[PDB]
């Protein structure tokens, strides 16, 4: 549906343990213009689909009342994900040392402050 441009809103679950099952989808939805949102809890998508794991939810077709609520969601989701994609694509997450080692380097930095001033 995202290739043939039928999808209005793509919901992607967070916890997919082989992440190769997902990692094409953000750049693909970015190219095809469909807004996508990353939501936490792949089991939480299962309780609406009567199943354990769901991994993805497509929105293509809306009722009469829900159109204004869906557009109100799509605006904030385009504010978060799609329009900040060129920002997000260059961040390297992680690289966080252990808190004991961080505390030791900070204590040595206070020792450097004691040496200087």
């Amino acid at each position: 549906l995202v290739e043939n441009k039928k999808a209005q809103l793509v919901v992607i679950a967070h916890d997919v343990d082989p992440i190769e099952l997902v990692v094409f989808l953000p750049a693909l939805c970015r190219k095809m213009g469909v807004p996508y949102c990353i939501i936490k809890g792949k089991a939480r998508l299962g309780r609406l689909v009567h199943r354990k794991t769901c991994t993805t939810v497509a929105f293509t077709q809306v009722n009469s009342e829900d159109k204004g609520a869906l557009a109100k969601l799509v605006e904030a989701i385009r504010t978060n994900y799609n329009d900040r994609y060129d920002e997000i694509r260059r961040h390297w997450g992680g690289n966080v040392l252990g808190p004991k080692s961080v505390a030791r380097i900070a204590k040595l930095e206070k020792a450097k402050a004691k040496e200087l001033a």
């Binding site: 082989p18 992440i19 190769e20 099952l21 990692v23 094409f24 693909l28």
Partner: protein
């Protein structure tokens, strides 16, 4: 629709997105045991094109082997033979390591039948395979008559007679000018027909 993207993302495996996942999974599989039962495949499409249809009865084992060509088991480097055979350190052992993993998985669980196997990881010494196993006596496979061939009893322990994908590639069988070494069936059958000196009643 999406397994094409799965396969292509797994295809160029030396890029920076995938090799992080590969390094994490190599550490993950090295810290566990040698043979255990993964609940679900880690390469879904590649396991699926070997025959994994995710229903009741298709088991996935993860199995670990050690690298390196085999060392000849004679003690203290003593071959007791001609200078042809003194080479203790350098033999490669014809069979492939994938078929070694298939042999170990099958004979550890001899109740099952081996369908195929594939690669999932390597770091220095340990090489990691995943082996699909088909249950012979579950009713979901004893029905559905496209699948009854493995329930037919001539396929007990395919891995030790070398009928799998890596088994055929180790036995070395194809067609044409690059395969006259085994003209029919196997190299021993070819050797049998070529050196069986044939004699008729009338000569």
């Amino acid at each position: 629709g999406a397994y094409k993207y799965i396969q292509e993302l797994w295809r160029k495996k030396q890029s920076d997105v995938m090799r992080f996942l590969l390094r994490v999974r190599c550490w993950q599989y090295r810290q566990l045991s040698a043979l255990h039962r993964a609940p679900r495949p880690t390469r879904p499409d590649k396991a699926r094109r070997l025959g994994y249809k995710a229903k009741q009865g298709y088991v996935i084992y993860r199995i670990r082997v050690r690298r390196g060509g085999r060392k000849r088991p004679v003690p203290k480097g003593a071959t007791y033979g001609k200078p042809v055979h003194h080479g203790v350190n350098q033999l490669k052992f014809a069979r492939s390591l994938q078929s070694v993993a298939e042999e170990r998985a099958g004979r550890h669980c001899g109740a099952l039948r081996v369908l195929n196997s594939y690669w999932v990881g390597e770091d220095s010494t340990y090489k990691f395979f995943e082996v699909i196993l088909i249950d012979p006596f579950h009713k979901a496979i004893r029905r559905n008559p496209d699948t009854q061939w493995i329930t037919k009893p001539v396929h007990k322990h395919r891995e030790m007679r070398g009928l799998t994908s890596a088994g055929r590639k180790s036995r070395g069988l194809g067609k044409g000018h690059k395969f006259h070494h085994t003209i029919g069936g196997s190299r021993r059958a070819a050797w049998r027909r070529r050196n069986t000196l044939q004699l008729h009643r009338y000569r």
